[PDB]
Amino acid sequence: SAGIATFKLVLNGKTLKGETTTEAVDAATALKNFGAYAQDVGVDGAWTYDDATKTFTVGERLIFKVKMPEDRMNDLARQLRQRDNVSRVEVTRYK
Protein backbone atom coordinates (compact mmCIF):
# COMPACT_ATOMS: atom_id res chain seq x y z
CA SER A 1 0.00 0.00 0.00
CA ALA A 2 1.43 3.33 -1.13
CA GLY A 3 2.32 5.68 1.72
CA ILE A 4 2.43 2.77 4.16
CA ALA A 5 5.70 1.48 5.62
CA THR A 6 6.71 -2.17 5.33
CA PHE A 7 8.06 -3.99 8.38
CA LYS A 8 9.87 -7.33 8.60
CA LEU A 9 9.52 -10.05 11.23
CA VAL A 10 12.20 -12.69 11.80
CA LEU A 11 10.81 -16.03 12.96
CA ASN A 12 13.18 -17.83 15.32
CA GLY A 13 10.95 -20.00 17.51
CA LYS A 14 10.92 -23.74 18.22
CA THR A 15 8.65 -24.71 15.33
CA LEU A 16 8.02 -21.29 13.79
CA LYS A 17 10.91 -20.43 11.48
CA GLY A 18 11.30 -18.23 8.41
CA GLU A 19 10.37 -14.67 7.45
CA THR A 20 7.21 -12.58 7.14
CA THR A 21 6.24 -8.95 6.62
CA THR A 22 3.37 -6.54 7.26
CA GLU A 23 2.09 -3.16 6.13
CA ALA A 24 1.83 -0.61 8.94
CA VAL A 25 1.97 3.11 9.71
CA ASP A 26 4.37 2.59 12.61
CA ALA A 27 6.30 -0.01 14.61
CA ALA A 28 3.51 -0.21 17.18
CA THR A 29 0.97 -1.26 14.56
CA ALA A 30 3.46 -3.63 12.92
CA LEU A 31 4.00 -5.42 16.24
CA LYS A 32 0.26 -5.79 16.81
CA ASN A 33 -0.13 -7.31 13.35
CA PHE A 34 2.84 -9.61 13.95
CA GLY A 35 1.30 -10.53 17.30
CA ALA A 36 -1.85 -11.76 15.56
CA TYR A 37 0.28 -13.78 13.14
CA ALA A 38 2.21 -15.47 15.95
CA GLN A 39 -1.01 -16.22 17.83
CA ASP A 40 -2.56 -17.93 14.81
CA VAL A 41 0.43 -20.27 14.62
CA GLY A 42 0.42 -21.01 18.34
CA VAL A 43 3.42 -18.84 19.19
CA ASP A 44 3.75 -16.06 21.76
CA GLY A 45 7.35 -15.68 22.92
CA ALA A 46 9.78 -12.79 23.37
CA TRP A 47 9.05 -9.71 21.27
CA THR A 48 12.01 -7.54 20.28
CA TYR A 49 12.76 -5.12 17.44
CA ASP A 50 14.88 -2.19 16.28
CA ASP A 51 13.02 0.76 14.78
CA ALA A 52 16.25 1.87 13.11
CA THR A 53 15.89 -0.90 10.54
CA LYS A 54 12.21 -1.74 11.00
CA THR A 55 13.17 -5.28 12.02
CA PHE A 56 11.20 -7.47 14.41
CA THR A 57 12.14 -10.80 15.97
CA VAL A 58 9.93 -13.32 17.76
CA GLY A 59 10.69 -16.64 19.44
CA GLU A 60 9.89 -18.68 22.55
CA ARG A 61 12.44 -19.79 25.15
CA LEU A 62 13.26 -23.46 25.73
CA ILE A 63 12.91 -24.87 29.24
CA PHE A 64 15.22 -27.55 30.63
CA LYS A 65 15.42 -29.40 33.95
CA VAL A 66 13.80 -27.15 36.55
CA LYS A 67 14.30 -23.84 34.74
CA MET A 68 11.51 -21.31 35.18
CA PRO A 69 10.14 -19.24 32.30
CA GLU A 70 12.37 -16.24 31.61
CA ASP A 71 11.24 -12.82 32.83
CA ARG A 72 12.29 -10.93 29.70
CA MET A 73 10.10 -13.21 27.61
CA ASN A 74 7.05 -12.87 29.85
CA ASP A 75 7.59 -9.12 30.17
CA LEU A 76 7.79 -8.41 26.44
CA ALA A 77 4.82 -10.68 25.76
CA ARG A 78 2.82 -9.07 28.57
CA GLN A 79 3.34 -5.60 27.09
CA LEU A 80 1.93 -6.75 23.75
CA ARG A 81 -0.86 -8.81 25.29
CA GLN A 82 -2.11 -5.75 27.17
CA ARG A 83 -2.46 -4.06 23.79
CA ASP A 84 -4.19 -6.97 22.07
CA ASN A 85 -6.86 -5.46 19.82
CA VAL A 86 -6.28 -2.08 21.45
CA SER A 87 -6.06 0.95 19.17
CA ARG A 88 -5.97 3.52 21.97
CA VAL A 89 -2.55 2.45 23.23
CA GLU A 90 0.85 2.75 21.56
CA VAL A 91 3.83 0.41 21.92
CA THR A 92 6.86 1.66 23.85
CA ARG A 93 9.93 1.67 21.60
CA TYR A 94 12.29 -1.23 22.28
CA LYS A 95 15.72 -0.25 23.59
Query: Is residue 18 a part of any domain in this protein?
Result: yes
Domain extent at residue 42? 5-81
CATH of the domain at 38: 3.10.20.10
Query: Is residue 14 a part of any domain in this protein?
Result: yes
In degrees and rounded to multiples of 5, residue 46 shows phi and psi of -70, 140
Three-state DSSP state, 48: strand
Exposed, middle or buried, 48 (CB in 10 Å: 0-12/13-18/19+)?
middle
Query: Is residue 89 a part of any domain in this protein?
Result: no
Q: Give how many domains the chain has, as a whole number.
A: 1
Three-state DSSP state, 42: coil
Q: Which residues contact 10 (CB under 8 A, 6 or more apart)?
A: 19, 55, 56, 57, 58
Question: After which residue numbers is the chain interrupted with C–N beyond 2.5 angstroms?
Answer: none
Query: Is residue 64 a part of any domain in this protein?
Result: yes
Distance between CA 4 and CA 62 in Å, rounded?
A: 36
